[PDB]
Curated annotation (Swiss-Prot):
Induction: Up-regulated in regulatory T-cells (Treg). Down-regulated during neural progenitor cell differentiation. This is Ubiquitin carboxyl-terminal hydrolase 7. It is found in: Nucleus; Cytoplasm; Nucleus, PML body; Chromosome. The gene is USP7. The lineage of its organism: Eukaryota, Metazoa, Chordata, Craniata, Vertebrata. Isoform 1: Phosphorylated. Isoform 2: Not phosphorylated. The chain holds residues 207 to 560 of 1102 of the full protein. Hydrolase that deubiquitinates target proteins such as ARMC5, FOXO4, DEPTOR, KAT5, p53/TP53, MDM2, ERCC6, DNMT1, UHRF1, PTEN, KMT2E/MLL5 and DAXX. Together with DAXX, prevents MDM2 self-ubiquitination and enhances the E3 ligase activity of MDM2 towards p53/TP53, thereby promoting p53/TP53 ubiquitination and proteasomal degradation. Deubiquitinates p53/TP53, preventing degradation of p53/TP53, and enhances p53/TP53-dependent transcription regulation, cell growth repression and apoptosis. (Microbial infection) Contributes to the overall stabilization and trans-activation capability of the herpesvirus 1 trans-acting transcriptional protein ICP0/VMW110 during HSV-1 infection. Changing H251A: Complete loss of activity.
Length: 356
């Protein structure tokens, strides 16, 4: 079926997990992550409690299964077992849960630090007083960036807006402590950009006049090749911040009952597939990229299919982030534990039908 068409298998549609399946594929094809994950020492773990073991299972099955892969034990493991869990959280929050879990499980192993190595960048947020000599600098790690979309035509304009200087004057002067209220400038600077760049687009904005979040379907364009050197405080001549589009997570509709899919070119070679739960299919570059720009603001239709998250990988890191994964990257002990796991579930299904 879809494994035979594309080389890639899908994930089952099992309840309403919204953006989850999209995110799981995204992470699975972050090959360096997937390798580290197989290396976690989950020997002792409980399969319905351990996010690390449950993820190993999902990735292993994605790598070896010919049929669509289930996620029930994974959702049970991090406790998001209803629509409501998914409705209470942004996509990046789920991603943070998965990454934190596996990062913690890599402590004291041969693969410790993989998660910050791949996903962590450095920024500094500042408030500079204009008339007095005072500055507050807050250095922060980030694993993702939330880009403003409203009134922005493209990623370049969002980044421009992201690093824009805000004037704190008049009615909103800065409380400068013992200097009293002071005229000031506020901004954020990027010190580094991580090898794997996760960008969420801010389409689900609070609306005062309906007192709810509403999805903004406006046009927002993102390129295949993304140069970010100009947003770095200090550029690097031997490692320019040139990024290549890896994944486009897409939503259709106006609510969490809409359709979620993800487009990926897993090898970073511009050859794209559409991942729609159990159906993986080849698609054009144009289907993956421009057709998810949205807008088209055309009267007969409501056009509400568009990108909400993008994954870019730094050109200089691409061959290493998307380093290939072979049978040798899956420890035998893990393979045995996962077969043991498939047998125990094959027995729980037989015991469940007998009682009914
Ligand atoms: C209705 C549906 C809900 C949903 O699944 N998502 C909630 C929003 C989502 O987290 C993207 N996203 C992430 N951080 C933010 C922030 Br912070 C402000 S708005 C914002 C946003 O929009 C993706 C998952 C949706 C889908 C796509 C775009 C807009 C709405």
């Amino acid at each position: 079926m879809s494994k035979k068409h594309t080389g890639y298998v899908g994930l089952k549609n099992q309840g309403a997990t919204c953006y989850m399946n999209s995110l799981l594929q995204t992470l699975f094809f972050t090959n360096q992550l997937r390798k580290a994950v197989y290396m976690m020492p989950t020997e002792g773990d409980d399969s319905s409690k351990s996010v690390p073991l449950a993820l190993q299972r999902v990735f292993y099955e994605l790598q070896h299964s010919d049929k669509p892969v289930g996620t029930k034990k994974l959702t049970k493991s991090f406790g998001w077992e209803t629509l409501d869990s998914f409705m209470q959280h942004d996509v990046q929050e789920l991603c943070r849960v998965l990454l934190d879990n596996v990062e913690n499980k890599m402590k004291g192993t041969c693969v410790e630090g993989t998660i910050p190595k791949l996903f962590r960048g450095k920024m500094v947020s500042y408030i500079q007083c204009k008339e007095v000599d005072y500055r507050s600098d807050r250095r922060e790690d980030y694993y993702d960036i939330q880009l403003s979309i409203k009134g922005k035509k493209n990623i370049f304009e969002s980044f421009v807006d992201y690093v824009a200087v805000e004037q704190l004057d008049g009615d909103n002067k800065y409380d400068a402590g013992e200097h009293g209220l002071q005229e000031a400038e506020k901004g954020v600077k990027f010190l580094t950009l991580p090898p794997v760049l996760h960008l969420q687009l801010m389409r689900f904005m609070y609306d005062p006049q309906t007192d709810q979040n509403i999805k903004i379907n406006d046009r927002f364009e993102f390129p295949e090749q993304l140069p970010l050197d100009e947003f770095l405080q200090k550029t690097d001549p031997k490692d320019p911040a040139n990024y290549i589009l890896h994944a486009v997570l897409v939503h259709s509709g106006d609510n969490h009952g809409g359709h979620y899919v993800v487009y990926l070119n897993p090898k970073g070679d511009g050859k794209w597939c559409k991942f729609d739960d159990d159906v993986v299919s080849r698609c054009t570059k144009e289907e993956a990229i421009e057709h998810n720009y949205g807008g088209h603001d055309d009267l007969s239709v409501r056009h509400c299919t568009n990108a909400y998250m993008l994954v870019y990988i730094r050109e200089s890191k691409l061959s290493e982030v998307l380093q290939a994964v072979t049978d040798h990257d899956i420890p035998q002990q893990l393979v045995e534990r996962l077969q043991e796991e498939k047998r125990i579930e094959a027995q729980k299904r037989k015991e469940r039908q007998e009682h009914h």
